Amino acid sequence: GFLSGKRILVTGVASKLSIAYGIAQAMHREGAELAFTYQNDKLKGRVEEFAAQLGSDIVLQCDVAEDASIDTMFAELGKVWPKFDGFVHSIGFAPGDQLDGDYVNAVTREGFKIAHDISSYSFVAMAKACRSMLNPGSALLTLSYLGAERAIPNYNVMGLAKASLEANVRYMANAMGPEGVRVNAISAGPIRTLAASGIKDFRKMLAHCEAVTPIRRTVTIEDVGNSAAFLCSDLSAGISGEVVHVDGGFSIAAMN
Amino acid sequence: GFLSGKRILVTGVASKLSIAYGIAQAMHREGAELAFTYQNDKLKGRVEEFAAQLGSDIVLQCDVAEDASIDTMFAELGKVWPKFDGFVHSIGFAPGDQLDGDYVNAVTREGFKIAHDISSYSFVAMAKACRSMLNPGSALLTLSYLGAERAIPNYNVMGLAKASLEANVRYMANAMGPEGVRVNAISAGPIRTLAASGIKDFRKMLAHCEAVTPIRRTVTIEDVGNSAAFLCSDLSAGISGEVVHVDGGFSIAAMN
Amino acid sequence: GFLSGKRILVTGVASKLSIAYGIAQAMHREGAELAFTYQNDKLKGRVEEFAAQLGSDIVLQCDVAEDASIDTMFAELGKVWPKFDGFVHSIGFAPGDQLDGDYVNAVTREGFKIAHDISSYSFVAMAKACRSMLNPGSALLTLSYLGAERAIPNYNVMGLAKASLEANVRYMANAMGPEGVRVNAISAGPIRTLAASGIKDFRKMLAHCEAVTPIRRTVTIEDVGNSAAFLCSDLSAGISGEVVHVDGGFSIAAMN
Amino acid sequence: GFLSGKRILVTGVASKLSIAYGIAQAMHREGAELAFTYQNDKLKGRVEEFAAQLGSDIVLQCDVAEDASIDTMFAELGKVWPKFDGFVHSIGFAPGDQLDGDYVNAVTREGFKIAHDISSYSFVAMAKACRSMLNPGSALLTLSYLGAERAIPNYNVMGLAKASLEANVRYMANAMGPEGVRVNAISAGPIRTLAASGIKDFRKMLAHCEAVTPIRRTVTIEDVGNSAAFLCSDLSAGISGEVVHVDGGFSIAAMN
Numbered sequence A, B, C, D: 001g002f003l004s005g006k007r008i009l010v011t012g013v014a015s016k017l018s019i020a021y022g023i024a025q026a027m028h029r030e031g032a033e034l035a036f037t038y039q040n041d042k043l044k045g046r047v048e049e050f051a052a053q054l055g056s057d058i059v060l061q062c063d064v065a066e067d068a069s070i071d072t073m074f075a076e077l078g079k080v081w082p083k084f085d086g087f088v089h090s091i092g093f094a095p096g097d098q099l100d101g102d103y104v105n106a107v108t109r110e111g112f113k114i115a116h117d118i119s120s121y122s123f124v125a126m127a128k129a130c131r132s133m134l135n136p137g138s139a140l141l142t143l144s145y146l147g148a149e150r151a152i153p154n155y156n157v158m159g160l161a162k163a164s165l166e167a168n169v170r171y172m173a174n175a176m177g178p179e180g181v182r183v184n185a186i187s188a189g190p191i192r193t194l195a196a197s198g199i200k201d202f203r204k205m206l207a208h209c210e211a212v213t214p215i216r217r218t219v220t221i222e223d224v225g226n227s228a229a230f231l232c233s234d235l236s237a238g239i240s241g242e243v244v245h246v247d248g249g250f251s252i253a254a255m256n
């Protein structure tokens, strides 16, 4: 595969519907060796089953709200992977109250704090912690959403965290590029996942996109995963700091 | 002038070089009634002097890091301006350690938290706090920098904070527009100010910019203040959720 | 007013609904001296009436499809305004066949040629033709549409023409800035005008926009003219090579 | 390869340094069947040698300035490829005089005409002519440059043609998407090619980029070709109307 000889760490696999899950499959189909992290014990065993299917016995607990957790995970990771080639950051979070109705009324200081910390900061946090274990030709990838670029109803403060994140991709890419590390983001169209269910009228959001999207269908985790495998492979060597839209063309069309 | 009948609240006047200062002067020259806030005790009397000069005797304290301070300032404001027509948010802050050398190495969880809290959240926190005192036709304004859109050396996490901020403008503009409130931002080119001194080799920025800028000069606080008065007056009724670049054209040129 | 002492040349007044008309009115309300051009004989007397009303008796013919017409208009202009302070380019055209149904099927080599020639080239052709009559502090302005940035149904090749136009603003701003000339564009939201009637289901555009627009209303020629007066006055000294959106916020929102 | 079972037509191979050449290699390495066009007889035999190496005996003359030439080529193409899966548009042109010094002085009506016609229109022209021979899952790709987004010295009118083109990708993608056709663009960093030699100080342009680019090197046709193979493969199914930057990160960095 085009990822043969690559060791990539994959975050965010909550279930078989997760973008991370679809991403690991594409990467594994492409010859990459994978390592998975699980946020907690509620998720532990599940992630272990998926690791096994993708031929990996590296499943480490990691909660990006904690520096020491990121730190410990990388330590256990180095035991098998002293040096690796990148990671996939598929982690996003905002307190439930943050996501519905008028943004100005919903947003609070803490919610803003948590949303930016978990969705934006965690990306660089993970980079700091493993920066020295990365081989040249490494690539990091995170997942963003159009709410970063446009004011989308109910997405509220998550739109700001995503905007922060995209700026992170640029700052990381400019800082880590000179040492052989690329950093990019896939701006994915809406996909029904556990987290998606936290946004009001997601079902109508999906149907809308399916209708107004040039390709005339919503994207799949297979679609996203394929772009992800590419962005983390040497095939995308000339791309860094880029936010690739994998939404079928939705954001470029208008009043369809 | 074109702001006659407008009562505007101006924040961030730390000195006669402050962008907020240059903005207050233009808004005063165009007929507006102003109210000033000062962050702390160190700045108080300085702000009172300028206020007096701009014919205002409404100088209230406000530390945007504290909700209670934001809430009290508006209660105090209500006593004189039960209803007013918008405010200028000219506040920014990132801990000193954050602003120099490699981004990834420089950034920390608290620096990120703080940079975002003071540079981005505070904007919406203020809007929430006075949402009901705003008259139809009200305009809210904030100041951003190109760091939001491009990875600029040393600007580091402040670029991420601005990215979040510009997103905020869009989400606030979308949320408040329905009740008669516009929200926009001026993306100002570099200007030597108190806070400007906190970035490495700023002197070279200013000169680099002066040379590669289409208008061939760096912008002024007079420049920025005229655009801000415009953006907080009825002259800009057709504009909302916009980040206008008052950088003399610097960002649209390349390899000049 | 803020344009007192400014002599501006206004193009594209086809009627009292014309954006150029609403612009001329604001520029006149702010103290500017205007000069008007009319495309042909059919429009001549109409333009003379408005001119007279806006206190001007300088009405010259100008078909931007002909260099010689552009050259003669300026020679005639020189006789009264040897030097002036900029002009408003409010001219757009694509053959009728170009504007409806599927883009690819609708577009032809000549329609493309024409749409670009009249909607984009003409802007720089006029600047070339008067480059030496422009005083320092001069401003050039043009009008664009969101079609440049997003694929909008039926707008077809005109969107490509606008894309070329917005690029022109940037290249002209960069080239002329050094001699004291700023060049910008207003990206106006839909407004019912003579040319507006040439697009399919425009009535539904206007209503769709009125509903999904942050300010909850479509912009007016008054709205656009105040932003244009601002952009052609010294109030916008810090702005050049910029495409300001006077669409009430429509483009920054999504799935409203 | 990931392009196995794909028949792609490749335009623009002038020499072994051509972006098209590097693109065909990547596509051929990935299992795709290719067909090549040559603009003229000066180029004919050369393109035939490259076709042979890439295992293709389909080399058709095509000059995109002529509808009948595009038309005839597709007719001869259908003889072997009744239906195919897409094409690579790597064609750009502007009269020599257009490319040096002050844009406003260099640009002329004809130069603008030719530059837009050959660099922008030809893309859709080719799409019109073959629209019905495309299988579902087809993808078209064109090559753009940052001069479309920023005013780059000496690029002059080519920057406008590229802006027109990028708008074309969006219009094409929105029109052809519903029938199973994606349209995208690679915005390539500077690469020394025959055409490149038409831009003043290209050598200094290259060195600059190599220094200020996050990856710290200029891109290669291998880099571009790899992204091209991906954008024309089912791997990029969720991407359409996108302008992917393959420039190492140059456009996202600032004042490096």
Ligand SMILES: NC(=O)c1ccc[n+]([C@@H]2O[C@H](COP(=O)([O-])OP(=O)(O)OC[C@H]3O[C@@H](n4cnc5c(N)ncnc54)[C@H](O)[C@@H]3O)[C@@H](O)[C@H]2O)c1
Pocket: A011, A012, A013, A014, A015, A017, A018, A019, A020, A038, A039, A043, A062, A063, A064, A065, A089, A090, A091, A092, A093, A118, A143, A144, A145, A146, A187, A188, A189, A190, A191, A192, A193, A194, A195, A196
């Ligand atoms: N699904 C969509 O429609 C969509 C579209 C664009 C982008 N995204 C992004 O893709 C990523 C994956 O989202 P998803 O939709 O697949 O949902 P998901 O629920 O499958 O995955 C969310 C993941 O984030 C993890 N996470 C959150 N907080 C954590 C923490 N504190 N520490 C460690 N892990 C934590 C959860 O365990 C989970 O594995 C998110 O960034 C999301 O914003 C989603």
Ligand SMILES: NC(=O)c1ccc[n+]([C@@H]2O[C@H](COP(=O)([O-])OP(=O)(O)OC[C@H]3O[C@@H](n4cnc5c(N)ncnc54)[C@H](O)[C@@H]3O)[C@@H](O)[C@H]2O)c1
Pocket: B011, B012, B013, B014, B015, B017, B018, B019, B020, B038, B039, B043, B062, B063, B064, B065, B090, B091, B092, B093, B118, B143, B144, B145, B146, B187, B188, B189, B190, B191, B192, B193, B194, B195, B196
């Ligand atoms: N100066 C530049 O070149 C430039 C360019 C682009 C953007 N900006 C932005 O303009 C705004 C004003 O900054 P400036 O350059 O005029 O500098 P300045 O130092 O004169 O003012 C910044 C203001 O921030 C206030 N502030 C800091 N923390 C705050 C808090 N906790 N509570 C209340 N107020 C707070 C300070 O009192 C100060 O008045 C900032 O957002 C800045 O990022 C400046």
Ligand SMILES: NC(=O)c1ccc[n+]([C@@H]2O[C@H](COP(=O)([O-])OP(=O)(O)OC[C@H]3O[C@@H](n4cnc5c(N)ncnc54)[C@H](O)[C@@H]3O)[C@@H](O)[C@H]2O)c1
Pocket: C011, C012, C013, C014, C015, C017, C018, C019, C020, C038, C039, C043, C062, C063, C064, C065, C090, C091, C092, C093, C118, C143, C144, C145, C146, C187, C188, C189, C190, C191, C192, C193, C194, C195, C196
């Ligand atoms: N009306 C809208 O909703 C809207 C929105 C965005 C952009 N625009 C732009 O505003 C500008 C003015 O158009 P409008 O909507 O006011 O319509 P309008 O029909 O009132 O005016 C367009 C003008 O184009 C002039 N024109 C056409 N070909 C020209 C030529 N060959 N020589 C000289 N002049 C030429 C006509 O005389 C006419 O005055 C156009 O660029 C248009 O694309 C309009």
Ligand SMILES: NC(=O)c1ccc[n+]([C@@H]2O[C@H](COP(=O)([O-])OP(=O)(O)OC[C@H]3O[C@@H](n4cnc5c(N)ncnc54)[C@H](O)[C@@H]3O)[C@@H](O)[C@H]2O)c1
Pocket: D011, D012, D013, D014, D015, D017, D018, D019, D020, D038, D039, D043, D062, D063, D064, D065, D089, D090, D091, D092, D093, D118, D143, D144, D145, D146, D187, D188, D189, D190, D191, D192, D193, D194, D195, D196
């Ligand atoms: N090389 C770079 O630095 C760079 C960067 C970004 C984008 N691009 C684009 O890539 C494409 C390929 O450029 P290149 O740099 O490889 O140069 P090149 O000289 O190898 O290729 C240019 C091709 O366009 C063809 N062409 C031009 N007019 C033609 C016509 N009338 N009909 C048919 N074919 C014609 C020429 O035969 C040639 O094959 C162009 O669009 C160029 O703008 C180049």
Ligand SMILES: Oc1cc(Cl)ccc1Oc1ccc(Cl)cc1Cl
Pocket: A091, A092, A093, A094, A095, A096, A099, A144, A145, A158, A189, A190, A191, A195, A196, A197, A198, A199
């Ligand atoms: O960002 C997303 C965008 C869409 Cl359309 C759907 C799901 C998304 O993902 C999230 C949304 C809200 C929270 Cl709290 C956490 C996550 Cl992971």
Ligand SMILES: Oc1cc(Cl)ccc1Oc1ccc(Cl)cc1Cl
Pocket: B091, B092, B093, B094, B095, B099, B144, B145, B158, B189, B190, B191, B193, B195, B196, B197, B198, B199
């Ligand atoms: O944002 C700015 C951009 C420039 Cl070019 C100059 C000064 C700026 O203002 C700040 C920079 C850093 C911090 Cl800590 C706080 C502020 Cl207010």
Ligand SMILES: Oc1cc(Cl)ccc1Oc1ccc(Cl)cc1Cl
Pocket: C091, C092, C093, C094, C095, C099, C144, C145, C158, C189, C190, C191, C193, C195, C196, C197, C198, C199
């Ligand atoms: O650009 C426009 C955009 C909108 Cl929404 C409405 C009218 C416009 O104006 C034009 C549209 C088509 C052609 Cl043929 C010429 C012009 Cl002047």
Ligand SMILES: Oc1cc(Cl)ccc1Oc1ccc(Cl)cc1Cl
Pocket: D091, D092, D093, D094, D095, D096, D099, D144, D145, D158, D189, D190, D191, D195, D196, D197, D198, D199
């Ligand atoms: O677009 C380009 C951009 C760069 Cl940096 C280098 C070469 C380019 O390609 C061209 C430039 C000018 C002409 Cl007339 C034709 C072509 Cl193909």
